[PDB]
Amino acid sequence: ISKGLTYTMCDKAKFTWKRAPTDSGHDTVVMEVAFSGTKPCRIPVRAVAHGAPDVDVAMLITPNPTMENNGGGFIEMQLPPGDNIIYVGELKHQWFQKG
């Protein structure tokens, strides 16, 4: 439940896609994960555009995302139209954004 603005970061390698990055029907990008590390933690999310793997381009639509023992793992963000590599730690997906 409680979206942790103050929770410590999750492990970059202990993630799995509960829902790969997809469109909300509304030109925003929803995704969901399941996680083998600490409960609670804050999800090390980013979306990194074609040619700049350093630069997060994600404007989050849902709050600062967390992984919990009573929910968690869900994320919504908006991105520039184009190829964007969406990470949850070092677990990635290839998101061809529309909008």
Domains recognised in the chain with CATH numbers: 1-99 (2.60.40.350)
Nearest to 11 by CA among 89, 92, 74: 89
Distance CA 62, CA 64 (A): 7
The number of beta carbons lying within 10 Å of the beta carbon of residue 43 is 24
Distance CA 60, CA 29 (A): 9
Which residue carries 């979206």 as its tokens? Answer: 3
Which residue carries 């520039």 as its tokens? Answer: 80
- Structural biology method used: NMR
Tokens found for residue 3:
């979206």
E strand map for 1-99: 15-23, 29-35, 41-42, 45-49, 59-60, 66-67, 74-78, 82-88, 91-97
Q: Please, how many CA atoms are within 13 Å of residue 95, restricted to the half-sphere of its CB? A: 32
The number of beta carbons lying within 10 Å of the beta carbon of residue 71 is 11
Distance CA 61, CA 28 (A): 8
